[PDB]
Design a protein around this ligand. Structure first.
Ligand SMILES: [K+]
Ligand SMILES: [K+]
Ligand SMILES: [K+]
Ligand SMILES: [K+]
Ligand SMILES: [Mg+2]
Ligand SMILES: [Mg+2]
Ligand SMILES: [Mg+2]
Ligand SMILES: [Mg+2]
Ligand SMILES: [Mg+2]
Ligand SMILES: [Mg+2]
Ligand SMILES: [Mg+2]
Ligand SMILES: [Mg+2]
Ligand SMILES: [Mg+2]
Ligand SMILES: [Mg+2]
Ligand SMILES: [Mg+2]
Ligand SMILES: [Mg+2]
Ligand SMILES: [Mg+2]
Ligand SMILES: [Mg+2]
Ligand SMILES: [Mg+2]
Ligand SMILES: [Mg+2]
Ligand SMILES: [Mg+2]
Ligand SMILES: [Mg+2]
Ligand SMILES: [Mg+2]
Ligand SMILES: [Mg+2]
Ligand SMILES: [Mg+2]
Ligand SMILES: [Mg+2]
Ligand SMILES: [Mg+2]
Ligand SMILES: [Mg+2]
Ligand SMILES: [Mg+2]
Ligand SMILES: [Mg+2]
Ligand SMILES: [Mg+2]
Ligand SMILES: [Mg+2]
Ligand SMILES: [Mg+2]
Ligand SMILES: [Mg+2]
Lengths: 186, 158, 178
RNA sequence: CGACGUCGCUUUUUGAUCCUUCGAUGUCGGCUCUUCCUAACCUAGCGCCGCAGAAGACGCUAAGGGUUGGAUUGUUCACCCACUGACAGGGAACGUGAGCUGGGUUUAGACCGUCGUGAGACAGGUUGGUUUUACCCUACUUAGCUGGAAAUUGCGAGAA
RNA sequence: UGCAAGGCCGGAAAGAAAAGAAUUAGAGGCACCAAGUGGGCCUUCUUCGGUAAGCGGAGCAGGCGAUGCGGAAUGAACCGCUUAGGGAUAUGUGGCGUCAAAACUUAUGGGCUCAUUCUCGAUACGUGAAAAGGGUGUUGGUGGAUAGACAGUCCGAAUCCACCGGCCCCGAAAAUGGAUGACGCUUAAGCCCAAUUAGUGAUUGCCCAUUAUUCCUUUGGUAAGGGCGGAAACAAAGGAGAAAGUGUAGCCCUUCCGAUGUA
RNA sequence: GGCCAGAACCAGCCCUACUGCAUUAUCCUGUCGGGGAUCAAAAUCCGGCGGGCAACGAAGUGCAAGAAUGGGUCUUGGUGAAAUGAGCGGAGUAUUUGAGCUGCGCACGGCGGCCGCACGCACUGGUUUCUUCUCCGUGAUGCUCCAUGUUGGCGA
């Protein structure tokens, strides 16, 4: 086993990172985020004066060490989402039947997917803001905005998986809703 | 064996050794066998007359009878819970003088010679000393006993 | 805990005979739980290298080579073991320990755990204390850091055997059954 | 999809054996009824294809549910006709005879062919040929009476 | 006068030396009269026929049969030990999380392992369940290499290839609900090594036998011995016995050894 | 009291505490050189040379023989109806075990007659500097068995 494995993260000036019992709270200009990491058993340390975040594993084999960079990646995603946000833009791709998408508040209704009469409905959680781009700018573009990368990507994924083609060749029939661009709000 | 004839299962027992074939030599003819002598009963494969049964091959017994061409030998044979003194009749070619009492006879002669020397006042031969005793060991060359990598590299063929 | 193997030096030879009046004297170092096992390993080695049986040999001395003063050291143990599937497998392993006997006992435990090798299928070819800069594995070299520090996390601390209790108050040291 | 090879698995075949039963464990098939298995026929979800669609091939999780009407044959099997989403494969003393039935096998009557001098024989064909008993104990189905926390006592004292 | 054979008379006899130079719970022989039995089975190792078999057939030797007791949860045969009626103390095999006695879950011992519907493993005999093949799960080893290297778009430290192990996983489908014996166990209560209160100051942790040692009692010997010529004295208001004996409540005492068992 | 308990002591037996003798060298320790790492160092490591006892409870190394002159016996009998006693009596301040030191010859080791002898054997050698119990003692005129304390409780 290795005595000491260490990962360090730098923190931007605006961000505030606090750890207490493997629970990380990240505060930026556009909100706050929380992460429950009590399943990890790592030594999380924040240096406020030097604005560094450190995660340490003591006496670890390969499996515990693999969690260090996972923790650093989660905290970095929280910092980025609390200072810039996440914006996932999905596109409706169809051959013949135009996929009709309605965004009334937090509810997404998908109609006419491959000409079907069934209505696919998604209730986006309140931490993710879903909008629909004007068709004159980009046709069939739905945008997800949020501070949490995991929540935004999960919403885009559940929208993608509501429109899977069943009982047809998948190489053909490329109809679906696919995330195209993953960028930041600011 | 599948049959129980007189010479069953003697293919290797009653065969001559490699490059040692031939009839018994003149030294066998000229050997004097007495009644009471210890003899070895070893069948000569090339004679085939007066041949012992396979059981008595390699047995040592005492001569009880001498005939013009045969020897009477008493052999111990275990049968069930007792040993029988079997009297077998073989030709002299299948008999050898037994050295089974050679060491005892030498011991007796050495004891008689020792007594004669002790009577004559001659100095007896020095008594041999035990090799099991202790003592100082002065090693002329001392080597290290160890296992080397080369031993493993050698014990692997090809 | 003190090592379960001792460092023995067995000195022996073939018994002098008329054919071999002054036999060669061999010095053999072995790690064994007692001196009877040490003599057994010595006579096995004499049999397999010099064709000298114990029935025709002498053991001049079977002494324990004392350990040095306990100092944190890097020990290089060149060791081999036999398995039916692989034959003889030789390996060179580095250990942190305070003595040669401790290092070899640790090597035997390591072979028993990581390769299921038992004592009589194992031959220690050599054990040497090496400097820090000759250590190649990072699992040992990490103990050469001058500022080597670590906390004691996930401790399982049991009370003194007399003080141990079956039932104790939840946020208190008062024993209810003890 | 796999030739030459090679490693398994399963007792839904048949053999091999002879452990149990010969003061007897009723010994074909069907009928009826329940349940179990999964090596999945249909039904639920899917992956993959020489996957355009339709129809399909292969594979995974899954045995919850379903898996038929008939002609011939004692049949198990077989075959054909017809419906169906489908007409999957098996076990339970080769489930099940004090549950039935008795067409077959396998007594005594009789006929034929072949065999035998003959009496008779033939795992060859044919026809006719007693299917006994529960009121006991359990199990199961319902149907009643009735004490009991020290599971009958201690007074032995614990409240979701 | 040599040889062979029966004797007779003498001699010498470590009574068998020294060189590792035997040991013995070593009375050797000889009969007579009879019983059961003459179906055998299992096992280590060797072995033949058979694809194999809890199949058939042999060799050496141990068992069961005829035999319990203590262990392997359970089993004629495996392990230990084999047995008069009882204590005490120690063990054997096997164990010490509970069932269940023992680590009230021992150590101030080291490593390894995560196993989702027959549910990872803990199954000596017992094959009384698993293989060929495979795994970028993890932990070891053996060779080779490349070192501002590999990757990434340059830029700061180790990276790559082949092969072989340990444990785990896939391979791995059957019929009543079910079996490491059950529950559970994962800072193991699993696996492989070690130990006995722990680098402190020496070499016996603990529990369990119809075994060992020891004590008491019984019984029988191929039993071994002592005493038995009443020593002397002694009323009531120290006592009694003392048999020359196979066997009895055994003359009496002491002392050793053995005690299971179908036909 | 031929019942139930407690304690005391005696003999036997069963457990425990109390430890000496050998050994250590691949060891201990200074110094010089190398090498290592540092921020500089020391260390880990390798050689030479000089001294040695790692001696605190030195070692977890080989053998131990240390007179319980502390527990248990509801695991045995007893209360002196024979006490055999290093233990109970009597009498003496001694006996002689070992450990130190040491004489002669031999033995052993080295060099090949000397030089060494760790202290081996014979003189059952010397010295008592430390350590120690040393002698005597009771037949059965008992063939055998059984019959003998203390303190309470319960029994009038
Ligand atoms: K029958
Ligand atoms: K189903
Ligand atoms: K039937
Ligand atoms: K130096
Ligand atoms: Mg299609
Ligand atoms: Mg032959
Ligand atoms: Mg021959
Ligand atoms: Mg009947
Ligand atoms: Mg019946
Ligand atoms: Mg399936
Ligand atoms: Mg199908
Ligand atoms: Mg389907
Ligand atoms: Mg029908
Ligand atoms: Mg069947
Ligand atoms: Mg049936
Ligand atoms: Mg029935
Ligand atoms: Mg009936
Ligand atoms: Mg009929
Ligand atoms: Mg005719
Ligand atoms: Mg008929
Ligand atoms: Mg008829
Ligand atoms: Mg002799
Ligand atoms: Mg018979
Ligand atoms: Mg058999
Ligand atoms: Mg019998
Ligand atoms: Mg068992
Ligand atoms: Mg037995
Ligand atoms: Mg207990
Ligand atoms: Mg078992
Ligand atoms: Mg096995
Ligand atoms: Mg494999
Ligand atoms: Mg279980
Ligand atoms: Mg068990
Ligand atoms: Mg006195």
């Amino acid at each position: 086993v290795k005595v000491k494995s260490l990962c360090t993260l730098q923190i931007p000036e605006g961000v505030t990172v606090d750890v207490k019992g493997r629970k990380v709270t990240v505060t930026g200009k556009r909100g706050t985020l929380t992460k429950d990491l009590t399943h990890l058993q790592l030594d999380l340390r924040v240096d406020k004066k030097n604005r560094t975040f450190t995660v340490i594993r003591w006496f670890g084999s390969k499996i515990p060490i693999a969690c260090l960079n996972t923790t650093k990646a989660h905290v970095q995603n929280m910092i980025t989402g609390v200072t810039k946000g996440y914006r996932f833009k999905v596109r409706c791709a169809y051959a013949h039947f135009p996929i009709n998408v309605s965004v009334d508040g937090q509810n997404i209704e998908v109609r006419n997917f491959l000409g079907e009469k069934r209505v696919r409905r998604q209730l986006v959680p309140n931490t993710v803001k879903v909008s629909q781009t004007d068709p004159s700018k980009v046709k069939d573009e739905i945008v997800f905005d949020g501070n949490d990368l995991e929540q935004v990507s999960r919403e885009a994924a559940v929208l993608h998986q509501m429109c899977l083609v069943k009982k047809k060749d998948i190489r053909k029939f490329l109809d679906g809703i696919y995330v195209q661009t993953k960028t930041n709000i600011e | 064996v599948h049959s129980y004839g007189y010479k069953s299962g003697t293919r290797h027992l009653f065969a001559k050794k490699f490059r040692k074939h031939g009839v018994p030599s003149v030294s066998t003819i000229l050997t004097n066998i007495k009644v009471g002598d210890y003899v070895d009963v070893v069948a000569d494969s090339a004679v085939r007359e007066g041949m012992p049964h396979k059981y008595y091959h390699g047995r040592t017994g005492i001569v009880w009878n001498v005939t013009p061409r045969g020897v009477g030998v008493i052999i111990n044979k275990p049968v069930r819970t007792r040993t029988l003194r079997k009297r077998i009749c073989v030709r002299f070619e299948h008999v050898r003088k037994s050295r089974c009492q050679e060491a005892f006879k030498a011991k007796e002669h050495q004891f008689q010679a020792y007594l004669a020397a002790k009577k004559a006042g001659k100095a007896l031969p020095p008594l041999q000393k035990s090799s099991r005793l202790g003592g100082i060991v002065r090693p002329k060359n001392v080597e290290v006993l160890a296992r080397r990598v080369a031993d493993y590299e050698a014990m692997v063929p090809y | 805990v003190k090592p379960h193997l001792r460092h023995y030096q067995v000195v022996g030879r073939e018994s002098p005979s008329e054919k071999n009046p002054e036999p060669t004297v061999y010095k053999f170092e072995v790690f064994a739980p007692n001196f009877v096992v040490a003599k057994s390993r010595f006579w096995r080695m004499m049999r397999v290298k010099n064709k000298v049986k114990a029935t025709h040999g002498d053991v001049l001395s079977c002494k324990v080579v004392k350990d040095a003063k306990l100092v944190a050291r890097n020990y290089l143990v060149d060791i081999a073991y036999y398995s039916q599937r692989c034959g003889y497998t030789r390996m060179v392993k580095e250990f942190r320990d305070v003595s040669k006997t401790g290092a070899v006992s640790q090597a035997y435990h390591d072979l028993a755990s990581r390769h299921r090798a038992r004592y009589h299928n194992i031959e220690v070819l050599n054990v040497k204390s090496i400097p820090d800069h000759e250590v190649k594995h990072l699992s040992i070299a990490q103990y050469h850091a001058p500022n080597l520090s670590f906390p004691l996390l996930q401790r399982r601390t049991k009370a003194t055997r007399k003080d141990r209790a079956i039932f104790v108050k939840k946020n208190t040291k008062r024993a209810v059954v003890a």
